[PDB]
Every structure is written in C-alpha cells, then in structure tokens.
Amino acid sequence: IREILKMGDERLLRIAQPVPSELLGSEELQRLIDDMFETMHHVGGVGLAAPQIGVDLQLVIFGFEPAVPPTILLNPRITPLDDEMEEGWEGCLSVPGLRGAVSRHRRIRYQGLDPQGQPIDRSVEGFHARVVQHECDHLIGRLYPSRITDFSKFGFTEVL
Numbered sequence: 001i002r003e004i005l006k007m008g009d010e011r012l013l014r015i016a017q018p019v020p021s022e023l024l025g026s027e028e029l030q031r032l033i034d035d036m037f038e039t040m041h042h043v044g045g046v047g048l049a050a051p052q053i054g055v056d057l058q059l060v061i062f063g064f065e066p067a068v069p070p071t072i073l074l075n076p077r078i079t080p081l082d083d084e085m086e087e088g089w090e091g092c093l094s095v096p097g098l099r100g101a102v103s104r105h106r107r108i109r110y111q112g113l114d115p116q117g118q119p120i121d122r123s124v125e126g127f128h129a130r131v132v133q134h135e136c137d138h139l140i141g142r143l144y145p146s147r148i149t150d151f152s153k154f155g156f157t158e159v160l
C-alpha cells in the first residue's frame with residue numbers, strides 16, 4: 001500500500017517512460033503490479049496508473065466485477081474508432097472530493113503488452129473505453145480537469 005499522489009504534484013505531470021523489455025516477466029515488475037492492486041483495492045478504486053504512486057512507467061491496472069475485465073496494460077496505444085463522443089461522470093483518486101463530466105470517445109481500440117510481453121489488442125465501448133482513456137491520460141500528464149468542457153458539471157461530491 002503506497003501513497004497516492006494528489007493533483008498539484010509535478011510527477012502527475014511527467015510523461016511516463018515505457019517499460020523496458022528486461023522487466024517483462026520479472027519478479028521486479030510483478031512486485032509493482034501486486035502493490036498497485038493492493039493500493040487500488042484498499043481505497044476502493046476502479047483504476048490506477050503507475051505515476052499516481054510515484055512510479056515513472058507506462059503501466060496501468062483496471063477492473064470492476066457495467067462490468068470491466070481485470071487488466072494489467074503496459075506501453076499502451078489508443079486509436080479512436082470513430083468521432084462519436086459521450087459525456088459521463090469521472091472521479092479520480094488523485095482528485096479527492098470532486099467529480100466532473102467529461103466527454104470521451106465512445107469507441108476505441110487499445111493495444112499494449114501484458115506483464116509477460118504477450119500483445120494485447122482490443123476494441124471496446126462505453127464505460128470500458130472511458131476507463132482506459134482516463135487511465136492512459138495519466139501516462140501523459142493529464143488529469144480529468146484538463147479534459148472538462150462543461151464547467152457547469154464540475155464540483156464537490158458532497159455538493160453534487
């Protein structure tokens with residue numbers, strides 16, 4: 001259980017480094033994965049990225065049992081499948097006390113590596129696409145506030 005970084009911290013603004021191929025398969029990485037799951041599971045979250053616990057790497061976990069399959073995604077790449085967009089709620093463990101409306105692609109393809117280096121290649125929609133988009137925004141130093149276009153829907157959770 002590592003500490004989750006809060007918005008304002010300059011490390012949630014780095015572009016993350018890719019996972020070097022030597023770490024694929026390794027115990028070192030697997031220790032990282034188990035810490036992330038340990039941390040995300042504890043604060044009740046749906047997703048975590050490596051940057052949010054201090055680690056400069058292109059590595060995200062996500063899962064929910066609008067179900068999303070448990071996944072460890074490395075070195076990700078995203079391709080919107082068409083122009084259609086969709087507004088929904090987003091919160092973030094780095095942005096405590098707050099919620100906002102964001103408009104994300106409805107349909108995406110994502111690609112990357114699993115923890116052993118096997119290729120991942122999926123097309124998804126709806127909440128699944130949202131979560132992947134939100135997570136991969138971390139690996140580029142973007143938090144959901146920098147994506148809001150309707151500030152009428154941005155505010156404190158105990159208010160909204």
Ligand code: NI
Pocket residue numbers: 091092093094134
């Ligand atoms: Ni987040």
